[PDB]
Amino acid sequence: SMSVKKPKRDDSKDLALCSMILTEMETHEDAWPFLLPVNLKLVPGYKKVIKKPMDFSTIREKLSSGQYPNLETFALDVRLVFDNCETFNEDDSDIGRAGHNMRKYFEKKWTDTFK
């Protein structure tokens, strides 16, 4: 509250550390469905159904241009990528499996780096 603060957690390295994680996700072999924005002219249903499209290249551009105010807003956009994937893709498909694998990979790196 006013003039009552918990001790200052060091956040000076968060930007660098989120960038490293994002690099690791970009280079994973199962990243291919997520590297670029879904082409809304060429994929029927996507535009109407997925209210907030997100992909790794869009996260990279936001990160590089100071559009994440803190590490939680970064994790929210990564998780949105995988939540979108589950909304549009069956679990038993290559893309559906890719999303599960990438979410797992991310959540471990997130915990190991920050928690």
Side-chain angles (χ1 to χ4, degrees), residues 1-7 9-12 14-114:
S1 79
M2 194 186 330
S3 309
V4 183
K5 289 307 173 324
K6 300 198 184 54
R9 185 210 163 246
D10 186 8
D11 67 339
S12 62
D14 287 357
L15 187 61
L17 285 161
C18 288
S19 176
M20 283 178 24
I21 293 163
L22 183 57
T23 298
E24 291 164 5
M25 277 190 311
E26 292 161 334
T27 61
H28 192 293
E29 68 167 285
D30 300 337
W32 58 269
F34 312 115
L35 294 175
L36 298 181
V38 172
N39 184 332
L40 300 178
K41 300 170 191 305
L42 301 187
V43 178
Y46 210 87
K47 189 174 198 299
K48 187 63 179 275
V49 170
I50 300 295
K51 300 310 178 168
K52 290 173 72 179
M54 189 48 57
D55 69 283
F56 298 167
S57 77
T58 300
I59 298 172
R60 172 69 74 187
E61 182 64 32
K62 290 178 65 172
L63 195 58
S64 294
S65 61
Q67 293 181 63
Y68 290 113
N70 57 54
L71 84 169
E72 304 302 338
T73 59
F74 169 78
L76 287 168
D77 264 352
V78 176
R79 291 167 181 150
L80 179 59
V81 174
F82 309 127
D83 294 342
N84 290 344
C85 182
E86 288 200 41
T87 296
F88 209 76
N89 296 267
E90 288 288 338
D91 296 338
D92 187 9
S93 60
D94 293 100
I95 289 167
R97 277 181 289 280
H100 288 296
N101 286 357
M102 295 304 306
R103 181 197 297 276
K104 189 80 177 181
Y105 184 75
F106 170 70
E107 294 300 347
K108 169 114 156 74
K109 304 277 184 182
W110 190 249
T111 299
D112 293 355
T113 299
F114 294 116

